[PDB]
Amino acid sequence: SLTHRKFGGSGGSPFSGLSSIAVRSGSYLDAIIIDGVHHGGSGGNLSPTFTFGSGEYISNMTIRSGDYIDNISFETNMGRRFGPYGGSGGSANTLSNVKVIQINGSAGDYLDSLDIYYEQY
Amino acid sequence: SLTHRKFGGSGGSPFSGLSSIAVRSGSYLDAIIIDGVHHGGSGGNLSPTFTFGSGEYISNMTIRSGDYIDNISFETNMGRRFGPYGGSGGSANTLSNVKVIQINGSAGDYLDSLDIYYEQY
Numbered sequence: 001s002l003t004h005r006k007f008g009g010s011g012g013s014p015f016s017g018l019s020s021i022a023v024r025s026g027s028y029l030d031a032i033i034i035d036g037v038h039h040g041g042s043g044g045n046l047s048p049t050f051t052f053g054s055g056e057y058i059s060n061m062t063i064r065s066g067d068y069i070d071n072i073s074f075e076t077n078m079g080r081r082f083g084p085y086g087g088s089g090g091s092a093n094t095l096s097n098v099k100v101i102q103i104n105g106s107a108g109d110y111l112d113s114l115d116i117y118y119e120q121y
Numbered sequence: 122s123l124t125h126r127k128f129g130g131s132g133g134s135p136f137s138g139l140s141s142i143a144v145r146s147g148s149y150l151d152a153i154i155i156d157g158v159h160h161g162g163s164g165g166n167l168s169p170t171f172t173f174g175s176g177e178y179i180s181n182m183t184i185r186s187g188d189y190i191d192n193i194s195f196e197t198n199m200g201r202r203f204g205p206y207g208g209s210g211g212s213a214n215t216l217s218n219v220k221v222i223q224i225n226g227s228a229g230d231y232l233d234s235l236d237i238y239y240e241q242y
């Protein structure tokens with residue numbers, strides 16, 4: 001059921017809960033690091049951390065996936081790019097004209113899966 | 122249009138991007154701190170940090186609000202409680218039998234507003 005509700009008044013400036021992202025990656029995604037928390041194994045190489053600016057969100061996103069997440073890249077509403085990181089296995093899926101709200105998933109020694117919650121425009 | 126999609130396989134342990142919450146509070150919520158990141162001003166007193174265990178999420182939430190967020194409390198599916206923190210003003214609203222996915226909002230000197238993304242059951 002993805003829904004939302006707003007509480008409170010009109011002032012202040014917006015913020016998002018999803019503030020930064022890095023991955024460890026080789027032939028697949030070994031890990032995803034979200035707001036500085038690590039999920040997945042120790043294999044592969046650690047990427048730079050992408051930290052969202054104020055009012056910046058993921059608008060375009062590409063994931064390769066089979067049994068695991070094989071690869072990820074994304075772009076933001078401000079033309080900033082992350083990746084691609086990972087291998088060529090899996091099949092490509094793309095999200096276009098979106099605003100990503102949250103990234104959940106499941107992870108063992110590898111990044112098994114990703115659940116992306118988002119708005120579709 | 123709010124949506125979600127899962128990519129990849131079914132192994133691994135589930136994880137959420139929303140891993141921890143603390144607030145600064147006095148009369149109002151001065152700030153909320155999401156995965157260590159501060160949103161709001163410097164006032165009030167800093168709460169302890171609530172960190173979600175694996176597969177733990179917010180299932181019930183009372184927020185009092187007016188022009189700002191006056192008070193927050195929540196219970197998780199595991200029976201753990203955070204708060205109440207803040208004061209007596211505003212009006213109460215409750216989310217009940219939900220699973221909160223993400224906490225966005227707006228903040229200045231204080232926590233003006235919360236935008237809660239959740240699934241309703």
Ligand SMILES: OC[C@H]1O[C@H](OC[C@H]2O[C@H](O)[C@@H](O)[C@@H](O)[C@@H]2O)[C@@H](O)[C@@H](O)[C@@H]1O
Pocket residue numbers: 025026027028029030042043044045
């Ligand atoms: O991201 C997965 C791994 O990617 C690279 O390893 C490639 C292969 O190396 C050896 O053949 C075996 O370990 C295979 O399992 C593996 O696919 C490395 O960067 C590794 O550290 C990653 O875990």
Ligand SMILES: OC[C@H]1O[C@H](OC[C@H]2O[C@H](O)[C@@H](O)[C@@H](O)[C@@H]2O)[C@@H](O)[C@@H](O)[C@@H]1O
Pocket residue numbers: 028065066067068069070088089090091
């Ligand atoms: O997401 C990873 C892979 O998912 C699928 O499974 C390929 C399988 O190949 C062999 O059976 C073993 O190496 C298994 O570990 C592996 O899952 C495919 O879509 C593949 O292209 C992906 O790389």
Ligand SMILES: OC[C@H]1O[C@H](OC[C@H]2O[C@H](O)[C@@H](O)[C@@H](O)[C@@H]2O)[C@@H](O)[C@@H](O)[C@@H]1O
Pocket residue numbers: 107108109110111112131132133134
């Ligand atoms: O992220 C991949 C898996 O991670 C953990 O299990 C790893 C095990 O997979 C197979 O049982 C064998 O290849 C073992 O050698 C290996 O340790 C679990 O979280 C699992 O659910 C994931 O699929």
Ligand SMILES: OC[C@H]1O[C@H](OC[C@H]2O[C@H](O)[C@@H](O)[C@@H](O)[C@@H]2O)[C@@H](O)[C@@H](O)[C@@H]1O
Pocket residue numbers: 146147148149150151164165166
């Ligand atoms: O949570 C907001 C503030 O709550 C308390 O402020 C008490 C009083 O301070 C000043 O007299 C005015 O701001 C009044 O409106 C307010 O009731 C304190 O904990 C303060 O530190 C917080 O910022």
Ligand SMILES: OC[C@H]1O[C@H](OC[C@H]2O[C@H](O)[C@@H](O)[C@@H](O)[C@@H]2O)[C@@H](O)[C@@H](O)[C@@H]1O
Pocket residue numbers: 149186187188189190191209210211212
């Ligand atoms: O959520 C905060 C309050 O919002 C409304 O009150 C507006 C006025 O409250 C106090 O007089 C000061 O903070 C003023 O700056 C502000 O304009 C009411 O809904 C109240 O009940 C809330 O506590």
Ligand SMILES: OC[C@H]1O[C@H](OC[C@H]2O[C@H](O)[C@@H](O)[C@@H](O)[C@@H]2O)[C@@H](O)[C@@H](O)[C@@H]1O
Pocket residue numbers: 010011012013228229230231232233
């Ligand atoms: O978080 C509450 C507000 O924080 C900032 O500014 C504080 C302003 O509060 C009242 O509008 C007046 O007392 C002003 O003098 C004072 O600067 C702003 O970010 C505002 O948008 C927030 O509502």
